[PDB]
Design an enzyme around this catalytic site. Structure first.
Site, PDB file in Angstrom:
ATOM      1  N   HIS A 130      -1.495 -15.449   2.465  1.00 40.07           N
ATOM      2  CA  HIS A 130      -2.530 -14.760   1.780  1.00 40.07           C
ATOM      3  C   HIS A 130      -2.862 -15.268   0.375  1.00 40.07           C
ATOM      4  O   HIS A 130      -2.522 -14.584  -0.626  1.00 40.07           O
ATOM      5  CB  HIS A 130      -2.191 -13.262   1.704  1.00 40.07           C
ATOM      6  CG  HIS A 130      -3.383 -12.393   1.439  1.00 40.07           C
ATOM      7  ND1 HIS A 130      -3.907 -12.172   0.193  1.00 40.07           N
ATOM      8  CD2 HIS A 130      -4.160 -11.690   2.298  1.00 40.07           C
ATOM      9  CE1 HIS A 130      -4.948 -11.356   0.280  1.00 40.07           C
ATOM     10  NE2 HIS A 130      -5.106 -11.056   1.554  1.00 40.07           N
ATOM     11  N   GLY A 154      -4.858  -6.466  -1.773  1.00 38.62           N
ATOM     12  CA  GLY A 154      -5.274  -5.160  -2.350  1.00 38.62           C
ATOM     13  C   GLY A 154      -4.540  -3.971  -1.635  1.00 38.62           C
ATOM     14  O   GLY A 154      -4.098  -3.057  -2.362  1.00 38.62           O
ATOM     15  N   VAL A 155      -4.269  -4.140  -0.347  1.00 40.25           N
ATOM     16  CA  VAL A 155      -3.512  -3.114   0.393  1.00 40.25           C
ATOM     17  C   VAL A 155      -2.109  -2.939  -0.148  1.00 40.25           C
ATOM     18  O   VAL A 155      -1.583  -1.793  -0.077  1.00 40.25           O
ATOM     19  CB  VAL A 155      -3.556  -3.236   1.916  1.00 40.25           C
ATOM     20  CG1 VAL A 155      -5.027  -3.158   2.388  1.00 40.25           C
ATOM     21  CG2 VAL A 155      -2.877  -4.513   2.382  1.00 40.25           C
ATOM     22  N   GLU A 199      -0.063   0.337  -1.563  1.00 39.42           N
ATOM     23  CA  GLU A 199       1.347   0.590  -1.194  1.00 39.42           C
ATOM     24  C   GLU A 199       2.265   0.745  -2.331  1.00 39.42           C
ATOM     25  O   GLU A 199       3.109   1.661  -2.314  1.00 39.42           O
ATOM     26  CB  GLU A 199       1.815  -0.465  -0.224  1.00 39.42           C
ATOM     27  CG  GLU A 199       3.297  -0.323   0.217  1.00 39.42           C
ATOM     28  CD  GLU A 199       3.528   0.839   1.196  1.00 39.42           C
ATOM     29  OE1 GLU A 199       2.544   1.411   1.777  1.00 39.42           O
ATOM     30  OE2 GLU A 199       4.756   1.293   1.287  1.00 39.42           O
ATOM     31  N   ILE A 205      -3.268 -14.767  -3.455  1.00 40.11           N
ATOM     32  CA  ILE A 205      -3.944 -13.568  -3.917  1.00 40.11           C
ATOM     33  C   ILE A 205      -3.142 -12.363  -3.473  1.00 40.11           C
ATOM     34  O   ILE A 205      -2.885 -12.252  -2.271  1.00 40.11           O
ATOM     35  CB  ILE A 205      -5.316 -13.464  -3.295  1.00 40.11           C
ATOM     36  CG1 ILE A 205      -6.254 -14.651  -3.617  1.00 40.11           C
ATOM     37  CG2 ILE A 205      -6.064 -12.153  -3.683  1.00 40.11           C
ATOM     38  CD1 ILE A 205      -6.657 -14.764  -4.983  1.00 40.11           C
TER      39      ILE A 205
END
Lengths: 142, 143, 142, 143, 142, 143
Positions: C49, C58-59, C63, C55
């Site tokens: 990723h 965003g998830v 979390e 990067i």
């Protein structure tokens, strides 16, 4: 009788990244067990096997079926005591019929055959979408 | 009828292990919808940590999987990403986690394009296991 | 009141590679908690990723903030009993403002809002170098 | 003023996950010094083994991180590595580990070129957390 | 006196991916220990060090030797109590003589020198095929 | 006399971490035999799961290692794989696991070409540790 992953962790000693039975769909003690292995891209061996072309290794289908014999054996005959192992002694007539790939749900059926000369003999058959992808005869012992 | 297997998926998304969370595309209609599968296996690296003794597929990764499925739809419909460009995940509305997803589950995800509005593309996603809804969310993305 | 990683391991059930709170810098029970997530290249998701362009997903900011609500909830209201979980029920208005990258120290502030209809509601704000990189409203429950 | 982010770092060092241990370069002066950051996170793969229940950043990896920072300085100052060439780590003098580095620490590392002598390049490194010295060492490298 | 991996796991607290002693071939308490580190391509650091050109990091030879001093110290002087650590305080004259690579069996010999100023001093020598690949002087303390 | 180290191996097999299980080739004669080494280390990712507290090299991975060694022999003898082609593992006869292989073991594997028959290439493998047989098997492969 279905077993989910927590029941499976209680029966087998295998852990990540070598526990290759995700669910038991049915079984009858001393006779048969039907298990699922979900094949996903997000499994660590896929990085290596192969880069750009993910193929579930045929040796891991053998492993997953042998694990499913373990679960049948423990449900049928008694759980392993801590520190004891269920030996994988041998394999006859392992046949790989077509490639198993990410997105496949491999349904595995193992049947007890007999005990003979100190080993327990099972046959395994793995299917995807109803078609056989692997068969083998497996010998195990406590 | 319009299925994409993993090699086709690798060619459309830039995500790689351990964060490519679409294992197959079952069907799609460009500019409209895409239905994808995420096979949930014990043998995935996050299960070691989430949680020891009680494997639970993280809800954030269902959002991620669905956002990836929007990516596939967007690329098939509108054009592939050029090298070095990203499809941004800008936001999320109304993410709802209905019941736990576990090893052995096959999570079927259906994403629908809604509209472009205010520089974002909006999609709704619904993830199901055995026909029951496990997660819904509205996802905004942009090139 | 600062909590370091051993105190954090005692409070949350999350383990590698999904424990995303590295330190608690301060908190007041029932009110707020301020936590750090150090973003490093040497984290396993960065391989994927993305290749050549790391990067922070965003998830995972969502979390990590939800984990920080957990720590506040356990310090405020009592530790989880073994086998119990703190459910992540939902998220409103998750907004990702700019990319979080290796070398960033993401400072996360979560505030208790209220209990309503069986859920506990928190707001989270994640900053890097004083600038907001993510906000969200999170609902959790025991 | 002269900062390098991770993409610039990937372009200069050949190291990749799980052994690229420089996360940013804060400043440098060619032929003289480089100041880099290693963010220490629980979410790093070696923490599982070092140690269960008590995460401690291995001292050998601080030496490694500092040696990587010398690499960056050397390449920026003297020329990039060509494909297939390596920057050898030949030795270490007086490595001293002063206190444990842990998750949540940002380890700021400052490496200085000393001299070339006897076919090696000699550097001194100092790693700090919150302004206090956690490790020092003298590192020898060569192309 | 040989120690295999289960005996080694009982003595050192290190676990995967940072337990770098695979076997003890001999030892004499308070004097010396001879250990093996098998170098294999299938180790996680090789992905990163380097892509296309696997080289065992010189820092991990230092680590593996320091682990072997640990085993000698625990066999000689007593096991660690749980939560206690054996500190790696420093290194003198670490010299890396040639690259260690997949397929190498690195044989490591560590010797106790003395206690001095609160530290225990050891020398280590690592060989492959009878040739020295690394030497170092290591200081440790309970 | 005819040895291949890891770089030569990477160039012949398509397998990569964590499923490249040949660490060296000690000798070979084209169309006849190949003798390879698999170093068995605790530091291999499958040991975490097989088994906690009692590391045992899986028997299926000895079959895999031997099948990889047949691949090397086949490629050296008959021609490299072209990009995107695979050397299929079609089956196995008479796999016998004689005693457990463990960390610290160096597993020396000897594979021999037997014949082509019925569209498959047949090989026998024997794996030894400290001179004693740990596994035998007959392996069928095809391009």
């Amino acid at each position: 009788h279905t077993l989910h992953i927590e029941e499976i962790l209680d029966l087998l000693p295998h852990r990540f990244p070598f526990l290759l039975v995700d669910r038991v769909l049915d079984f009858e003690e001393g006779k048969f067990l039907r298990a699922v292995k979900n094949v996903s891209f997000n499994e660590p061996f896929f990085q290596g096997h192969f880069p750009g072309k993910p193929i579930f290794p045929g040796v891991l289908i053998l492993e997953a079926m042998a694990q499913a014999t373990g679960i049948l054996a423990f449900k049928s005959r008694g759980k392993l005591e801590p520190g004891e192992l269920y030996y994988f002694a041998g394999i006859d007539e392992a046949r790989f019929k077509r490639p198993v790939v990410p997105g496949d749900q491999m349904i595995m059926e193992v049947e007890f055959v007999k005990e003979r000369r100190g080993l327990t003999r099972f046959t395994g058959v793995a299917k995807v979408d109803g078609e056989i992808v692997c068969t083998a005869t497996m010998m195990c012992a406590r």
